[model samples]
Target chain A: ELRTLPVLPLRDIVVFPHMVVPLFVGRDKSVRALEEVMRGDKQILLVTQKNSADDDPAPGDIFEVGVLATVLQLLKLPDGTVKVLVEGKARAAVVSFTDQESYYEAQIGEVSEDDGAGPEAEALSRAVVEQFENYVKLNKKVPPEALASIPQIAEPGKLADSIAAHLSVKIGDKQNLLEIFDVVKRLEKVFALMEGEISVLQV
Target chain B: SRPLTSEAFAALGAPALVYVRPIKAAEILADAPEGVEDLDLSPDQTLYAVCRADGERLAVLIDRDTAIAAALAHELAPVSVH
Candidate 1:
């Protein structure tokens, strides 16, 4: 879908497409949202907070803008808490929130996609990836072999999400990545961010 | 189309199922230390998420970090969003 999906506000977590992420729902509103989805079609919006103004806020409070995901599986733990596996479907933007009968409701639009890459774009992508690899190694998070199948040139936004989610960056930095829209520029900026982090490690 | 993973599920004799994010999978694969062998990514894999119409779910093995990076990168880039 070209239009962004509804913003599913979540805290302290991130979701990516084609991947399954389990979310624990205990809060009154979120549990209601979960119930609504399960009762209907098993589809729900998934979004995470970039950071909190306060160290800890009440549950169900998170940053706006999130991915839309499908409920893959649901279970009730011994404690009676609900655990659900939500699989990201696509990128979506939050348009508005409404107080529905059950829980928080969102109007969203799905971001669209195109399939072509320029020469400079490809080169910068490769460079950023290489630098990212170096950063990962230096930081000791993942090894080199894990990147074997990733293409040298990929969609910049995708690359940015992958980096932001895994790398140890501030919520503000990740939010910045979320704000920008230019592919080439985002790549360059992410490269710089990674470089800055690496420099700090060196120091 | 989503393939039915039920048969495999039956053979394996497992009940609970957990969804694994592509980027997290990538991170787990990427985190493989030295002297580790037999880790790889599937073909035609990119940043986008794929859904199956059939019952069987597909796990596109990848470095979780790389996948997250890829997804974040896609989320931010304007031109790339198309």
Candidate 2:
């Protein structure tokens, strides 16, 4: 699937499939964007700015790739702010921005996949889950049962997405995982990462 | 699988043991009080063995550096012991 969508400048936060992320919007423009999303189809595009710390830049200068997310839940914070749980739905690329009306809004193209393939898909799906299991076990920083209740492995893409979301590694490595187009290759890469850490322990 | 030529399998009756760590054992064995007379240290060469006090043998031939560096550094080297 391929998409061109509006880009949201973000920092520190990563959205994964089937994982609900809470976002706080305080700035006037950001608040307005949240309100617009709540009033409209409840979907917003999430894009991470390439240079998050870089100041004095217009929205157009931000990174191009982002995920299309739906507003699952919205809450009003005490200091006239808004808190929202954005559920990532699909991955998209920025096409164009109409205007900075109220908050930033853009016209984006959605990327999607057809129905399931077969055993090959199943095998890839299982590999993704196994890789996630290995990652969680090896990463000591994560809580023992961080996502125990959430059965993401059952859903295709969710396993890979969640692993990409929270594994301890460099940001560039995480981006590499996100950029991979093939499911099998993604699983292989995740497994290789886990295997690296495991070998260190044994060595 | 193709049958092995006689030259290749000639040592089938008596195979040599290959050891990955020789120096570690040499440092300890070279200093042994009773076994010191039987072994030769003139070549600066040593043998490493993972043998039990009851005499089960698992030995590896080690060169001087590996015997002293790998084995002695790991085993007989001073720890908290004065």
Candidate 3:
């Protein structure tokens, strides 16, 4: 089954599920999407598009995977731009995309990730968490609160998602993580990446 | 499989480790991103390449000893091919 939501195509950013982040809404169609989402359930599909030469995209340009985000707080700026903080809820795969007269709209379906964590998954979770701590120490700007709360996530899926979100990498690489729906594999991928980071940081 | 990017691959033990491998002159001249020029060389010469972690050839040397020393002089831990 498919549900309709106003699609917000992000440029150069992949919003992972459960990543609480703020975004600036400026473009006319993008603003309209947010306006309508707030009027309804405040649910919108956040999907990242490819690099733009600053040109508006067509309906066919939609990406395959998206995060269904709930609009949390909205602030209207003096320049008519809206700054909103949204909380990612879950992954939604696009069933069909439509360009509404006012904004982009899509019928999306829920994507279920493998959450039945075996012992292997749990072991990788610990490795990923430790590597993330090492990664944070190397990176000075990561908030201390991020470290405190991340280890508390017991679910393998959520743990991997949180680590991937905390990482500072290319947007495309972030999207690569979002595209994967497996719990254990994402943990392994993160460990490999962090292993590289530690070596890079070492003398 | 999620393939490793040059950044991630090179970031692994970067500057700390460099590899030395034998490569032919023809291999260096053909489809090489960068190599020596203006020096006359036979295509069959077994030149040694001091490479980065990502397998990027930094410089071509005449012998294995020269390549190993060159890598060490550059403050790298050189691993020569067996």
Candidate 4:
């Protein structure tokens, strides 16, 4: 259930499973963290920082839950910073930390989900989708065409992730979604979030 | 001169909403795109109005929850619309 991987601590962002994101590393320690992973399996534990201003975050400053990701591409910029495209592989929770010269490493346990899909889940999924559509209508900035594929995702877990990734919520809220291992519960939380947004927009 | 309905607010020109244009960092930094303007703020800073992908000179108010949303929204990338 537990594995060790290179850890990449982030500021102001929470990466969810099934999300592909680009990260820029400029700090000497973080850049070293990316390089260490790149030299090996290119796998990393992507965790978020509690404070955005913390240039160098210690283990206590980051969230316990994170995403295990693979480095798909690495681009070194002329300014000495590195641009990395990484894809989230799975959800992970930190078990323990290993001190290193450059970056922090951790013993992480895989967070598993339940296989609970039923009539309730299907209804929740539809409701969430409907709420998201209404949300998009009120928040005109989100392109309707971009979300045309949402209704087609019938699986509960994937649907939850897709909606969570695109929702314009706070980091704490997104992180809350990542930590929920129950597929139905995750969908319900997403439904509540979307419903809340719709209520505010209608006022 | 016109009434500010939701539609009217949405239809405002990008020039009217322009407080500051996106500024690319001369020096590369963390948590920002390469060669793209770095807002130097957290991804959750606020709602940003990025240019649409259809090549229109218009700006769409995006409720990007994170910095990655801004980076991935448009081809030219987006500046935080004030």
Candidate 5:
């Protein structure tokens, strides 16, 4: 399904599905973009930029895979920037760009994950949870109670997103996880990444 | 008090944790009252200090997000003491 939505180019952060983040929109175009979304429905496209230093990012500077989020709360800062609290609704891929005067706009198509669940997904999810536990245990910086709810998350997709959001991985790794549409594959990749971290910590 | 050995510290189940000890400075700045020795860690590596309810210092780590997450998990007050 294709839908046109207001786009917000993000820097240094990749918004993931099921993640609620508070963003500081300081750029003039981005502030205007937030205002545009506030006027209509609070729906906005949260896309990560290729370069964090790019002041005026074109459409090509953003990643194709982005999260479609709704503004839950909006606050106007004294510095003219807007503090937006948004909750990720779903994953959307930018299909084409639409001309907008102030901010970047795009026509996005909803990206759905494959429901391929079997022994593979179950094993992968279990492995990820286990590795995450060890990772948290070894790293005192990671709170043990923060992962107390991991066992309750049964869905592989949500589990993967939850772990990905908390891990101290780079933005590129998080973007890669977001781009993966297959639940099992996504979990496997997360496991590999967690395993890599575990290996380093063990050393 | 004597410092515990690395093996003994690891044996207590808290392994791979970096301990931040306090250092005394010869000269202190007027603007900056509390001055400590600089570990010269990289920009990516920041020291986040977790405090208990009574304002006692808890664990400190170089990772800011992890420290905040851990503090939130344990329901403690976390701040960048360094």
Candidate 6:
């Protein structure tokens, strides 16, 4: 599927599918983009950047693969910053950048997302889930119930996404998972990251 | 599209929630005050301001209850600032 949406460049964070993240937007162009979408469908393309510090990031600075999200809540702070709650819906890639000055608009196209996993994929998904539970027990910042309830999710790809959202590994690490669309492959990647974290925690 | 009066400005952040809180004149003078660019009001003056979701002051009122009620009237779901 193809569509045009306003692009909101994220800093130092990756939004995974089904994840509801609150964003604090203060830059002029970013605020302008939010205001425009609030006036309409309330949808925006969230892209992670190579360098988070670049205030006015060009298209080249951002990863072509991005999350398509819907704005759930928006607020304007006294400091002129916009606090917005956005939920990522699907993965989309930037086809082309639109010519606009007020905000970043781009033509985005989504591929036929295949989350179907194999017998081995299902095996790894649970393995990863339990290990994530292990990770949560050590971190103490995340609620353990997430691991207790992770069994409810059946899709290996979906579970990987939820785990990716919680992992404090690095922006590039999450982006790497985001780029890898293969369900079983994503699960394997998450397991690798989870094991490394648990070992570091024990030491 | 029209003039950005507090009345019309509220429409800009439509379909989005808002908050109302009491602000001091000195605070407003220092922060996001609309049209009050210096002069008028002493430092000790206190006011109730209709705020956007993250505390962008939209309207200033002398009464807290009125400010909340006014936000409700404008279809902006106002929550208590905590």
Model 3 lDDT per residue over A62-161, tens place = 5688899998766554334465667898898988877577988898888878767678987888888888888888777577898899989988888888
- In CAPRI terms, model 2 is classed as incorrect
Tell how far residue A19 is off in model 4, in angstroms.
1.1
lDDT of 6 at A203: 56
Structural similarity of chain A in candidate 1, as TM-score: 0.76
lDDT of each: 0.53, 0.52, 0.73, 0.67, 0.68, 0.75
User: Candidate 1 — which residues are off by over 4 angstroms?
Assistant: A1-8, A50-62, A112-116, A143-146, A149-153, A196-203, B1-82
Candidate 3 positional error at A151, Å: 1.4
For B1-82, candidate 5 gives per-residue lDDT tens digits of 1123433422322322221212112212332466543542234333544433222346654555666677667654332211
Per-residue CA lDDT of model 4 for B1-82, tens digit only, reads 1224433333333332221122223212433354433343445323323333211333423343443344444423432221
- Which ranges in model 2 have alpha carbons more than 4 Å from their true place? A1-7, A55-60, A113-128, A143-152, A197-203, B1-82
Candidate with maximal lDDT? 6
The residue-level lDDT of candidate 3 at A72 comes to: 76
* Shift in Å, residue A52, candidate 6: 1.2
In candidate 6, stretches whose alpha carbon ends up further than 4 angstroms from where it belongs are A197-203, B1-82
After superposition, candidate 4 runs with Cα above 4 Å error: A143-145, A196-203, B1-82
Predicted complexes: DockQ each? 0.02, 0.01, 0.01, 0.04, 0.03, 0.08
Clashing pairs in 3: none
Q: Is candidate 2 or candidate 4 better by lDDT?
A: 4
Best-fitting candidate, measured by DockQ?
6
Tens-digit lDDT track for model 6 on B1-82? 1224554443454455665555655666676556574433654544667766545567877666788788888878664432
TM-score of chain A of 4: 0.91
